[model samples]
Target: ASPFRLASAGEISEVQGILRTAGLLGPEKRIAYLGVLDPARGAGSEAEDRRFRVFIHDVSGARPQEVTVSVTNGTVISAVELDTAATGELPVLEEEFEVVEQLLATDERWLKALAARNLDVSKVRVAPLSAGVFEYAEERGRRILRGLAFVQDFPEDSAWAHPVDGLVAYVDVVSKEVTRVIDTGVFPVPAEHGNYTDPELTGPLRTTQKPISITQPEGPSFTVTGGNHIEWEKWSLDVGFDVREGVVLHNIAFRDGDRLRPIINRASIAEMVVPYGDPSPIRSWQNYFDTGEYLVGQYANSLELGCDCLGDITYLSPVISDAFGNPREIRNGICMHEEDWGILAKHSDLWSGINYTRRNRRMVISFFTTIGNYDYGFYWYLYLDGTIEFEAKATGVVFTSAFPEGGSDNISQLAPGLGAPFHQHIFSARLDMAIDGFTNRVEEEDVVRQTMGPGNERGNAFSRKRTVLTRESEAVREADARTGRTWIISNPESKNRLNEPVGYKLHAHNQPTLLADPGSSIARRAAFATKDLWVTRYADDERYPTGDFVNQHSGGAGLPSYIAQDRDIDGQDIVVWHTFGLTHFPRVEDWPIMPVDTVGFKLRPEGFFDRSPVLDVPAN
Candidate 1:
């Protein structure tokens, strides 16, 4: 199991069977993951290291399970059973609908709370939720779910629109009991008819636009060399799919002159959170840590052609382990296509009456992911010039609750009885950078106008300067847009044409960070979101910015824990974590479905290239 070959479905079943006989993969077991790595032992991975880390989810077990299996020989090299408690525990959603809700139905307080408001149980559904969790053989705290009610008249209705708020119940689905009930000032829930997808309610569709077509006569520019490896123009990147982070990119490089220079080693959307403004207990517990608590990749759509991406496309059909423990292939989970960007470079010199221009073409790699009321079509682009960009197009139904708009500053007035609470939609990306090589250094660059006294007494000069960040504490920085703030990851050994260190610049249009107070709950759980940038020395153990186990784990575990080491990072192998997203101050017009709130970050080569390498290309 070299990284050269991906794990097959056959191997997954065989390795799982071996572990089960050993009594390690016990009782309603799940193959949490089966992927390639050099496991933990050294000699186990000779020139041919067939090592697989198949972590079995410890279902009410004493200790977490970690087994490295050699599937070819059908035996476990080691069944190292003790680690921390379980991490990355994905709740089998099957239990919530059938068992949890059925258990909640029997409770008298839960039944009376909604019945008091004249709401029928048949026309609605209650869902067990994940907020601060619990666990114990002592049985004191064994991961509880706080329940919320939504009006779902049919199998598919706009249940999201009509929320039965304030009357919440804490249910221990494991023990089958409603532990706590809070009837926090019940009122008449809104009767807003929220089915916009129904054509009868949404009348008169437009047919105004004329027909247009996109045809690539010589076929698409992108060549899927192998499974997920793609090549387009000078750019080459390996597309990796994770059950947690959707479309992760690996070994992204660009050919310049005679060399294919390494840019980003591994890139993925690490963790994201949506924190609301409302101070109510129901709303307060809703600091939704998207990728951590509930994974974003499991929600990845088997995307539609033309509707999502148009002409000249290649779809990678990757398989996921289904609920029944079989490989389920999701075709069109990843879409690769080309987009026409207007112009790369255009200049007209009147001196010699010469006009020269080059078209700026883009290689678009897109993947769609949904988390209930919102949808995101994340795009990764590679330009003709040495530039890479990521844009998340946030669309779909803006979430609504039955709260009066005039009474609180927490929400935006949507319609007669519906409103959307203002929130920060923040996302962080982990970039394992390899600008030229592994030993790359980061510099905090801030554009500065010449200070009062020195060479700028003329008061007309402006320039940029760099500060070398050598430690984790020094690297925990914020964005300074006024100073044209950007972080440069440079290789001290790789020199450019002018003998400068070859580098790539990391940029975010410097948005806001977590607005909560220093010691607040949001700050504690998601301490990584407090800054726009974090630069830390690379560690195999430190992949997640929000730690390994974020679902109900204590706060200050991930980045803060990593940064606490304060390791020297000057010229070491480094990884950059960038925070970029939007603060959605919902408008009245954001009702029904929103029109894509898009925000992103870019990475362009600064001194990495010896010269402008694209000038020799033919005009499109």
Candidate 2:
């Protein structure tokens, strides 16, 4: 067998020097790259097809950098950087574009406004538009609200991954002739298309002719407990469906420490699904829902992730048949893209913030609590047929106090009634979900909300209000037979958004009543809906500064499903995915700064599949 050899001293020194120059190492910290090269290949073969991967480590024994490099003819063909932290100061902001004149040239109204004001036309390139979303910046308690005059004048509907408000656009308008756009939604849109709609408004759905249902087959089968918590150790994937238009439905549950629970008795709250297809032509349909600062519904047809509501509830089961040209249902497991946790919460109306893109093809879903948070991320790959391939992940960020010995009740004591103490600590988990091939079985550990502390569990009161029944039938046989399919039906019509008034009112009142009167009717009602620990906030020491509360709970990036970057792998072109992950660090400076790094992952799609399979749809 051929063996891999370590790099020589000279080569090791070279990599070390590069890290130092890049300021990737601290003042006294030492960094090293462990390189391996196969020595048994022929000269030409080695020169053209050799692989080089370097694993970087610091004195802390943390492998922060993993560089996958490709070489051709003794020169580096491409280098892939992975798993590195910000070792240097943040990059300086560069102002390179003129903002005012470009806007005046596009529409004469801007020129007239400047002429009326007697303003100088020297360095400005664009003018603010009333239809455009206002970009804001603040210094010393004074806020400056204006349009991004630096961005080029383009039609509002161009398909481009527009950067956040403050960053420099990579493509110059006059030079590249590509339009730069902005998304003012409640979530981040993948950098592919621009979607325009009221930030909050569900949809103007046009129902399709197809009938969708979930039918069960006969057997001693496992029953699907709809809208309830199903947990597995290390992972859990919940699948629910809705047939209504302009409604967002989801099932949320929190985790206690790292332990996963298998089954919890909370009932599911089913709601309508966001409509499918284009929203542009139906612009008049936008005003159907509450469309304002924090309360809005996303149009499902937009290209941006957060602005589109069609993505609320989705399902992924194994495809048993290759006869009709179906892609294999991924049975390995669902992996959560942890970075987009914050953004997903906003779009779902669990929190509030601006939406960043117009692409509606991707999705990020998250569940949050005082002790920890969980994220479920999905990317949809649409086939020419009506079917789509969905891939997902479940990730989390576990928070703990850096100063554990100081005091246990610090958060609760300080805030009194704001909720539980949330000292941020980052943790990553990879869940192992079993997908049965032959019988079509999905077994996962169910995570239960922790109730160890006084008044910890919130579902006790709400779960008692529901009565659920299970029904099972025979598995339907198809001409193109696929195996291991299970289905359950849920009538979301009976579920209300305000199932627990105490939880809703507590959030509505902002928890101030609990501090002054912990035993008041409002407090008691909220207690039934929310955890007592969360309402107490006795240990949260890391208080946010600068009054930027929007970023306090939400800040992260998202990637849609349709876009994929091509990477050269072993002389062949393959898809490379550097998707966004969860980020819990919400800095005051992130407001309007827009350049934020939370957590996410990059996928080297090469070697992921044996070959790209063809998907065929049946003729009607």
**For model 1, what is the error of residue 156's alpha carbon versus the real structure, in angstroms, after optimal superposition?**
3.1
TM-score of each: 0.92, 0.19
State the TM-score for model 1. Answer: 0.92
| Span of ten consecutive residues with least summed lDDT in model 1 | 133-142
Q: Model 2, stretches more than 4 Å misplaced?
A: 1-139, 142-144, 149-228, 231-620
Model 2: how far residue 432 lies from native, Å: 18
In lDDT terms, how accurate is model 2? 0.22
Put down candidate 2 lDDT per residue, 336-371, tens digits, no spaces: 121111121112333665443221112222221111
Each prediction's Cα RMSD?
3.0, 27.7
Compute the lDDT for candidate 1: 0.74
- What lDDT tens digits, residue by residue, belong to model 1 across residues 1-620? 23433345675677667777777766766555444442332343555655566555544545555677876677788876544333433333433445556766777887888788887777767755665533323223344567677777677787767777777777655556677888886755667666777888678777897866887999998887667778889887888776567778888998776788889988889888887777767666667766776567666888786678788788876655544345666678888888888988888998989888888889988788777677888888889888889998888787666666356678776666766777888888899888876888899998877766677777888888999999998999998888898999999998998999999898887888887677666787778889999998988878788886665565657898898899988888888999887888788666666888788999988978878868787865
Off by over 4 Å in 1: 1-7, 31-55, 58-99, 133-141, 452-454
